[PDB]
Structure formats: C-alpha cells, structure tokens
Amino acid sequence: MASEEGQVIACHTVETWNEQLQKANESKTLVVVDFTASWCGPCRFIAPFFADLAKKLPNVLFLKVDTDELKSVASDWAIQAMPTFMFLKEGKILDKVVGAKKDELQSTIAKHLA
C-alpha cells in the first residue's frame, strides 16, 4: 500500500512540468501550482503550508515551480509577484493567488474546498 501524501512535485525541468500538466489535463485532475523561489523568504515561509495542503489533498496534484529554476517558464506564465499560487481544475485554470497572502489564501482554498 503506497500512499505517499504531503508531497508536491517540484519541477526542476520543463519536462516534468509538461509531463504533469498534460497528465492533470488528461486525467482530469485538479492541479495547484506554486510559482515560487527557494531563495525567496516569504515564499519559503508559505512553502510548508502548501506541502500541508498536499498532505490532506492527495487527489489534488500540487506542483512547485521554482522561478530561479524555470525562469523562462515563469516569464511566459507571467509570474512577476512571488509567490503565485495557481489553482486549476482538471488542468483548466480557475483562479490564482498573487503574492503570499496568509488570510486571503485560506479564502481561496475554502473556495475550492469541497
């Protein structure tokens, strides 16, 4: 019985990023992506919470996109504020949270929490 929760897929390459998104689309999986940087303070501070989210939601695909890593990807998705949390459903973008917002994030989470 393999049930590994609490983990987020960190794409250090576009391949993993692509691989997961295509899968999320095809498998109609709800995906939440965090565009962030490991060298970013508030971004790192909000990181355990996103992992916590993964810990309760194994049916949701969580992804870490590091903006230092995938800087060109972050530029195409137009992520200028860090971190940006994007909530998609079935691979289709629903809504995103721009910047680390502690209280408001919760409200965006509750929106999707059902």
Side-chain angles (χ1 to χ4, degrees), residues 47-101:
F49 182 73
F50 191 76
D52 185 79
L53 292 181
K55 189 175 183 181
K56 274 69 66 173
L57 291 169
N59 183 30
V60 178
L61 182 61
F62 298 87
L63 289 160
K64 295 292 292 184
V65 177
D66 187 276
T67 51
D68 182 273
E69 195 65 279
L70 297 181
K71 60 183 302 181
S72 303
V73 181
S75 301
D76 188 270
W77 288 72
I79 304 300
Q80 182 177 90
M82 305 169 58
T84 300
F85 297 89
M86 184 178 300
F87 290 84
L88 306 72
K89 177 181 178 178
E90 297 177 76
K92 294 66 179 178
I93 304 177
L94 293 185
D95 50 79
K96 55 67 178 60
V97 182
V98 59
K101 302 172 68 184

Side-chain angles (χ1 to χ4, degrees), residues 5-6 8 11 13-15 22-23 26 31 37 45 48 52 59 62-63 75 80 83 89 104-105 107 111:
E5 36 52 87
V8 182
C11 308
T13 54
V14 183
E15 295 62 59
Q22 186 60 270
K23 183 181 181 180
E26 293 299 283
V31 59
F45 181 85
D52 185 79
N59 183 30
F62 298 87
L63 289 160
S75 301
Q80 182 177 90
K89 177 181 178 178
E104 196 291 279
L105 184 60
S107 303
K111 186 188 183 187

Side-chain angles (χ1 to χ4, degrees), residues 8-28:
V8 182
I9 294 67
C11 308
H12 293 267
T13 54
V14 183
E15 295 62 59
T16 306
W17 172 240
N18 184 272
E19 188 64 70
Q20 293 303 90
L21 290 182
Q22 186 60 270
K23 183 181 181 180
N25 188 31
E26 293 299 283
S27 302
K28 299 180 181 61

Side-chain angles (χ1 to χ4, degrees), residues 30-45:
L30 187 172
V31 59
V32 182
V33 182
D34 170 49
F35 298 90
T36 186
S38 182
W39 54 251
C40 174
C43 305
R44 197 297 178 204
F45 181 85

